């Protein structure tokens, strides 16, 4: 099947079994106190190695405390980090994967002070905990604090720290070393004309701006030797107004190959300060491949690998075939499904847990100093915890799952994988629950890949799927199961709003279910995630939409990465919104509201959508007590409304606990 993706390839002197690479992923799994590698991180990458990835890269390791940009970033500074580095390398090498250590000083994005650093040594002198860069300056956004200009001594020092960091990797069994010179970290800071305002040998012309990177490459090449694999990550476009152009990054790449032999180029897209889209669902697989074509036609000697929304094996396969790239790199797809490679080379892509790009468990959690997690993969960060082990339990109990939503299908999938006699009751004609409806939203198209997954596991696990069957207090008893899993989900709320009983009112479910004939002027009462996403679907059809939020901001329950995603879309669709508005009435023509200080104002509309919240659809659960079956359980939104992430987690936490 996926012949090209499974082809071998030599990276330097080391042969790689396939063309699938798991990219560096800082996940705060390391000890936040000192940057040492711990079991959580060891078992995390071990599973990615077991999964079949021909290459597994560690997270970006910080070469200096001032370069720590994540509360739990791996450290590459002192000898106290060697035991963990050797253990992690062996875990990856044992699985037949090429282990590669990444060296990453965050530079301008450092948060040493936020992590409790009062003072540090740099260039033989005491300094403050502020981040460092080639030029002292402030960030346009508040996340990154003002940086300090690096003395020429600190620059020479960091060249050595990279050399030493490469040594720590090689001497601990790592099969290769990767230099991280992307998205806005220290090296990228010197390469960019926007952040590098220096006039000495380290700044000015494109040659001087790239001197820092070249000296890091030359220094490491001498340290590791001509045989050791040396690769790097370099932007192909930084998406920064005033930064470097696409052809400049190509020229920089040429300079790197002229200085040392580059074994592999990982070309990236954008900076954390870029106002454009680089990794959100807005971008589809294959959109950035045109940048790879530029590097290939320009004569780049080393092979190239790319990622950034390349969550489709089909697209990657065609890419490797056409020579656009030489390796299919990926980070989020490797998080969502550690066994994606094994599933690809075994001709079973239908079993892939695809990445939806929710950016909640991975990007968002890591930037808020939290343990990384995954929406579709509840094992991320728990690969070490025996509580998530999947045990057989030869008893084989009879399990009845009520609700084919995400939580219900995750509970049944595992219970079936463990040998239980699972059955699912669905009152509708299709599985998916609210995911079946959200997939209609423009930015959630990936949710179709999720439906496919569960639809394929049910068909492969021989699970009893009873579609068009509304579970009642009688059918359950008739089925007489050993364990009852109630996953009815949630339903739209209906607050006490004068006139809410008017015909002009409708809820989210009816909209996405086509059980309503809307018009051209629509108004949504509620600025939460679900409400906004529903409006996007309404506007996509060519209709005027307005969102009314009583709170201070819209998209209040949206992660910081997706906030920028809705703005670009709500604006592209010409959508209006209002905050701090009081809902006073809903009549035939629309909804009457009031701002701060009276200011009564009507909103003429053809359809008013009450989408302020969701209610737990716990009707059935409360009708059948905990005595109807030897073991009764409620999971998902019916046991308390949460989001999709907490639903799949509840399902898997339930599928592995069904002992009897
Ligand atoms: C999520 C942010 C990183 C910042 O978060 P935050 O909202 O908390 O920043 P801040 O609070 O300081 O910003 C305040 C205001 O500016 C807005 N803002 C923040 N970042 C913005 C931005 N980039 N453009 C426009 N507005 C922005 C933000 O919406 C907010 O609006 P307001 O308070 O309501 O008035 C944001 O900049 C952002 O979404 N960046 C996009 C990330 C991105 O695409 N990076 C390039 C591709 S990712 C990549 O290749 C990569 C490589 C290596 C990595 C290693 C470690 C971890 C991840 C890595 C990713
Ligand atoms: C439009 C929309 C967009 C959303 N976007 C996001 C998002 O971006 N991020 C996020 O985290 N969350 C999002 N959510 C929320 C997320 O979809 C839910 O949290 C999640 O689907 C809850 O899963 P569940 O299995 O607990 O319930 P559900 O998904 O609602 O599953 C319930 C299923 O059980 C069936 N059922 C109910 N009662 C019975 C019965 N008596 N007998 C048989 N079958 C029954 C229902 O028909 C349904 O198929 C969105 C929701 C909507 C509606
Ligand atoms: C949580 C998280 C941590 C990341 N850590 C690193 C890192 O340490 N070094 C690096 O070069 N890229 C890092 N990245 C960027 C990814 O390696 C990858 O290039 C990017 O997320 C887009 O690729 P993808 O679409 O396959 O996810 C990280 C991304 C995420 C979401
Ligand atoms: S949390 Fe979302 S974006 Fe991150 S890996 Fe999982 S599915 Fe992909």
Residue numbers in the entry: 13 to 672
What does the paper say about this structure?
During anaerobic degradation of the PAH model compound naphthalene, 2-naphthoyl-CoA reductase (NCR) reduces 2-naphthoyl-CoA (NCoA) to 5,6-dihydro-2-naphthoyl-CoA (DHNCoA). It belongs to a distinct subclass of the old yellow enzyme (OYE) family of flavoproteins that are composed of three domains binding FMN (flavin mononucleotide), a [4Fe–4S] cluster and either ADP or flavin adenine dinucleotide (FAD). The architecture of NCR clearly reveals a spatial separation between electron uptake at the FAD near the surface and substrate reduction at the deeply buried active site FMN cofactor. The two flavins are electronically connected via a [4Fe–4S] cluster with edge to edge distances of 6 Å to FMN and 9 Å to FAD, respectively.
The NCoA structure in complex with the substrate NCoA and the product DHNCoA were determined at 2.2 and 2.4 Å resolutions, respectively. No significant conformational changes were found between the two binary NCR complex structures and between them and the substrate-/product-free NCR as documented in rms deviations of 0.45 and 0.49 Å, respectively. Reduction of NCR by excess of the two-electron donor DHNCoA (exergonic reverse reaction) was incomplete, and the neutral flavin SQ remained close to maximum intensity. Together with results obtained in titrations with dithionite, this finding indicates that FMN readily accepts a hydride from DHNCoA, and the FMNH− formed reduces the FAD and the [4Fe–4S]2+ cluster by single electrons, each.
